[PDB]
Amino acid sequence: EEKLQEKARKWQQLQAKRYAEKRKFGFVDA
Amino acid sequence: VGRLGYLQALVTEFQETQSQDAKEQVLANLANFAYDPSNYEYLRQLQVLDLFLDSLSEENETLVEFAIGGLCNLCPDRANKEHILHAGGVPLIINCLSSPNEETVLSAITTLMHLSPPGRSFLPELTATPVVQCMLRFSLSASARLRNLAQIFLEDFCSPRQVAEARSRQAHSALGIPLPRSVAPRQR
Amino acid sequence: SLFDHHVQRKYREGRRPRAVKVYTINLESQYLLIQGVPAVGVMKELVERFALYGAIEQYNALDEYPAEDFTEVYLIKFMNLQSARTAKRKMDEQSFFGGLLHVCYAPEFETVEETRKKLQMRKAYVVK
Amino acid sequence: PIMLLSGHEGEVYCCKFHPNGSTLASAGFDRLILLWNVYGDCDNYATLKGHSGAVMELHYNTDGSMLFSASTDKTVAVWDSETGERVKRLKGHTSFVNSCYPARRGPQLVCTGSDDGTVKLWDIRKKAAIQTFQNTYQVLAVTFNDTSDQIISGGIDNDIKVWDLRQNKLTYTMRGHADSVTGLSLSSEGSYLLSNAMDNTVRVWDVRPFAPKERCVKIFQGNVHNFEKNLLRCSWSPDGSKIAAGSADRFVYVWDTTSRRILYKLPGHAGSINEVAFHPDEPIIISASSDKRLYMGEI
Numbered sequence: 001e002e003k004l005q006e007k008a009r010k011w012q013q014l015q016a017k018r019y020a021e022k023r024k025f026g027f028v029d030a
Numbered sequence: 031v032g033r034l035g036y037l038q039a040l041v042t043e044f045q046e047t048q049s050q051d052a053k054e055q056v057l058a059n060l061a062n063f064a065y066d067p068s069n070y071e072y073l074r075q076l077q078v079l080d081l082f083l084d085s086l087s088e089e090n091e092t093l094v095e096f097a098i099g100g101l102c103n104l105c106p107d108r109a110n111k112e113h114i115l116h117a118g119g120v121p122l123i124i125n126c127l128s129s130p131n132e133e134t135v136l137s138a139i140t141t142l143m144h145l146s147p148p149g150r151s152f153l154p155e156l157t158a159t160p161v162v163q164c165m166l167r168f169s170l171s172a173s174a175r176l177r178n179l180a181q182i183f184l185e186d187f188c189s190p191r192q193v194a195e196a197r198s199r200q201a202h203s204a205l206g207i208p209l210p211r212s213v214a215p216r217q218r
Numbered sequence: 219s220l221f222d223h224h225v226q227r228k229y230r231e232g233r234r235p236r237a238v239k240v241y242t243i244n245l246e247s248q249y250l251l252i253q254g255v256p257a258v259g260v261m262k263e264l265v266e267r268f269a270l271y272g273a274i275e276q277y278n279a280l281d282e283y284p285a286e287d288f289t290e291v292y293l294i295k296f297m298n299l300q301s302a303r304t305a306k307r308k309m310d311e312q313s314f315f316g317g318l319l320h321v322c323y324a325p326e327f328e329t330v331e332e333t334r335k336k337l338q339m340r341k342a343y344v345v346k
Numbered sequence: 347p348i349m350l351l352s353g354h355e356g357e358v359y360c361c362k363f364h365p366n367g368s369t370l371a372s373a374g375f376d377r378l379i380l381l382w383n384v385y386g387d388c389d390n391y392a393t394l395k396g397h398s399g400a401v402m403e404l405h406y407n408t409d410g411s412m413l414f415s416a417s418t419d420k421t422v423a424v425w426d427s428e429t430g431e432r433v434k435r436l437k438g439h440t441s442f443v444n445s446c447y448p449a450r451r452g453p454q455l456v457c458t459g460s461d462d463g464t465v466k467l468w469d470i471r472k473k474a475a476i477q478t479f480q481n482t483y484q485v486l487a488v489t490f491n492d493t494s495d496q497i498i499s500g501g502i503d504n505d506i507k508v509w510d511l512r513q514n515k516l517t518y519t520m521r522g523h524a525d526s527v528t529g530l531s532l533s534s535e536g537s538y539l540l541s542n543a544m545d546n547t548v549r550v551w552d553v554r555p556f557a558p559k560e561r562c563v564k565i566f567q568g569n570v571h572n573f574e575k576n577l578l579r580c581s582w583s584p585d586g587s588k589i590a591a592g593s594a595d596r597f598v599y600v601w602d603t604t605s606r607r608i609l610y611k612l613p614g615h616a617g618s619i620n621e622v623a624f625h626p627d628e629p630i631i632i633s634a635s636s637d638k639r640l641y642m643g644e645i
């Protein structure tokens with residue numbers, strides 16, 4: 001239960017990090 | 031100033047002081063010079079191997095951990111390896127599998143692995159010792175590094191026939207049923 | 219666990235201060251863990267900079283790792299452990315894109331055979 | 347045999363085979379969807395442009411005219427396989443979307459799951475969500491039964507859930523994963539549903555009107571997950587005789603759906619493998635991985 005919530009939060013953090021817009025392919029600097 | 035003179039200065043600094051932290055710094059510097067190949071001899075000429083061996087006997091855990099770390103990189107050379115063995119420091123290393131810290135245990139395992147000699151010169155000693163029983167618990171521990179070390183240690187210091195006997199002894203302890211000392215494994 | 223960033227301190231004090239920490243052969247790894255990279259999308263420039271030293275088998279960014287805000291943590295696999303040592307030796311505490319850069323060895327990640335070769339090569343070098 | 351695939355700039359996450367076995371579709375982190383000729387010289391036909399996030403999952407409809415694409419930009423696009431023109435993108439979802447499955451042999455339906463914990467049923471003709479199943483735990487993989495009555499969802503709760511379209515209730519729970527489920531897929535018969543999970547277990551579950559109430563029909567092993575925490579997807583062979591699932595250890599694993607023996611372990615992937623697909627007519631495997639290359643293995 002509680003570890004399920006902590007795992008869900010950690011997964012959400014991981015997804016919000018790895019697929020951030022700043023890492024998107026073809027990132028123009030300007 | 032001079033390398034060997036500098037190491038001798040560290041030896042003096044260690045011996046005269048009593049503040050445990052100013053000894054922490056000395057054992058750090060000595061253990062990290064022990065990583066050097068060329069500084070081995072310089073250490074060999076100054077009885078600092080026995081300095082380390084005495085330092086494990088001290089009860090400051092950090093100091094003992096540092097001493098074990100110094101040993102680990104130091105033992106593998108053939109000259110130094112023989113000196114340490116002759117001292118009789120092996121039970122001092124054996125005492126360290128019950129040491130609380132992870133690092134110290136790892137260092138002890140590495141030193142034991144290093145002391146391994148070809149031609150079955152020292153393997154016989156390990157089978158007699160209860161260290162193997164302790165190793166089984168360690169191998170299946172949560173620490174990935176510890177697990178890797180335990181498994182590696184088994185190949186280096188154990189034998190398949192020996193391992194089976196060791197497993198049975200460990201199993202017997204769990205079982206609670208006594209095994210006769212006289213009985214021994216038979217070659218096939 | 220072992221990734222904590224220890225702090226510095228006569229003993230014939232050198233130019234740069236060192237924290238009290240002895241390196242054993244087991245401690246050292248060929249997995250190098252980098253923490254403190256600014257979160258500005260420099261994934262590839264950092265990896266190129268490190269590949270200057272040796273050859274990088276594998277690099278990935280591990281996002282599960284607890285990090286501070288707007289900061290990243292990375293893994294680098296080298297090919298030869300001496301290359302990893304020189305990479306630590308020079309890259310550690312180098313200002314990188316506006317951030318302090320902290321490299322530590324990552325022995326947890328390496329597998330049993332990797333430890334076998336590490337230890338064996340340590341024995342090879344020490345004997346000669 | 348063996349044909350290598352080159353062209354992708356970033357990780358490939360998914361690949362499919364056109365229902366008629368004439369072409370392949372592939373996409374990943376580089377946001378482009380590439381079409382390939384299965385035969386000839388394995389040429390690249392076109393590039394679908396318009397996804398701003400990464401493509402997490404492709405599917406073809408049963409006719410092979412429509413290609414569905416779940417992206418991390420919260421939009422699910424519907425693509426024309428013939429021209430490469432975009433048709434419509436699903437709207438409503440919150441945060442990253444993990445997967446989307448299109449119902450077959452029924453009026454057009456689409457199901458999605460995302461990091462907002464919800465599962466949504468889409469009618470491509472409405473431009474609005476039809477039903478919503480709010481789940482606290484982020485949802486990773488979702489598929490319809492052949493009757494288009496039930497929705498099967500795999501999340502991070504280690505529990506595959508089955509939803510009834512008419513009752514709108516949690517009909518079924520499946521226990522038997524010890525960790526997050528990353529990929530689901532129905533047998534061509536409707537009979538069995540295939541699952542991958544972070545517990546390194548591949549498990550087949552049987553869904554039937556009359557069931558045993560402990561549908562852990564079979565378990566397979568070999569398939570490893572690691573620090574990369576990539577979503578892992580598995581596929582059924584066209585005839586339901588073979589099971590393929592990708593892994594993070596560079597090997598494509600193919601098992602015998604009955605005896606459970608490993609038929610193939612295929613080295614040739616420098617990095618982690620994200621999806622394995624079977625050609626609909628002939629024993630050909632397309633393996634897609636994070637090393638940006640595809641292989642066309644023939645068995």
Ligand SMILES: *O[C@H]1[C@@H](O)[C@H](n2cnc3c(=O)nc(N)[nH]c32)O[C@@H]1COP(=O)(O)OP(=O)(O)OP(=O)(O)OC
Pocket residue numbers: 062065222223224225226235236237238239240241242246303306307310320
């Ligand atoms: O003796 C010093 C230093 O010489 C030694 N050390 C640094 N780097 C090393 C390496 O790659 N291999 C070995 N065997 N020893 C190495 O460690 C002590 C102190 O190290 P520091 O110069 O303080 O660096 P660092 O250990 O990284 O400091 P820390 O707080 O841990 O992290 C920045």
